[PDB]
Amino acid sequence: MQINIQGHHIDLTDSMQDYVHSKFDKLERFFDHINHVQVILRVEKLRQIAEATLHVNQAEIHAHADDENMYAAIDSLVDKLVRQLNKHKEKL
Ligand SMILES: [Co+3]
Ligand SMILES: [Co+3]
């Protein structure tokens, strides 16, 4: 798993990156076929937006989540990714 975190119109801090890494390190223990991962954190007006695309074996998992708080946005994003990963894990 190689994670690339990018920011847009936001002060991307090491805490955000550390937090993102933390969430994905937990995730890989349940889904072990995660190859490349892209994450984009950005702000649209007051909206804090977290985007992610996970490239897994023979498929892609994509989702966005937004919140007034970026860390909460990231947590919501992961919950969406986990749901999709569980479904995709089921198929396989
Ligand atoms: Co997207
Ligand atoms: Co791909």
Side-chain angles (χ1 to χ4, degrees), residues 3-43:
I3 307 171
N4 180 291
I5 304 174
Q6 294 299 312
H8 179 74
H9 291 182
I10 186 181
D11 173 27
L12 189 60
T13 64
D14 292 308
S15 175
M16 271 175 255
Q17 291 189 279
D18 291 337
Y19 187 69
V20 172
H21 270 289
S22 180
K23 305 292 292 188
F24 278 94
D25 279 344
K26 294 186 176 301
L27 188 67
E28 75 166 0
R29 295 301 184 130
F30 293 100
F31 312 104
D32 61 17
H33 301 307
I34 297 174
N35 303 311
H36 273 81
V37 175
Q38 175 67 50
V39 175
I40 295 183
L41 306 186
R42 62 182 175 96
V43 180

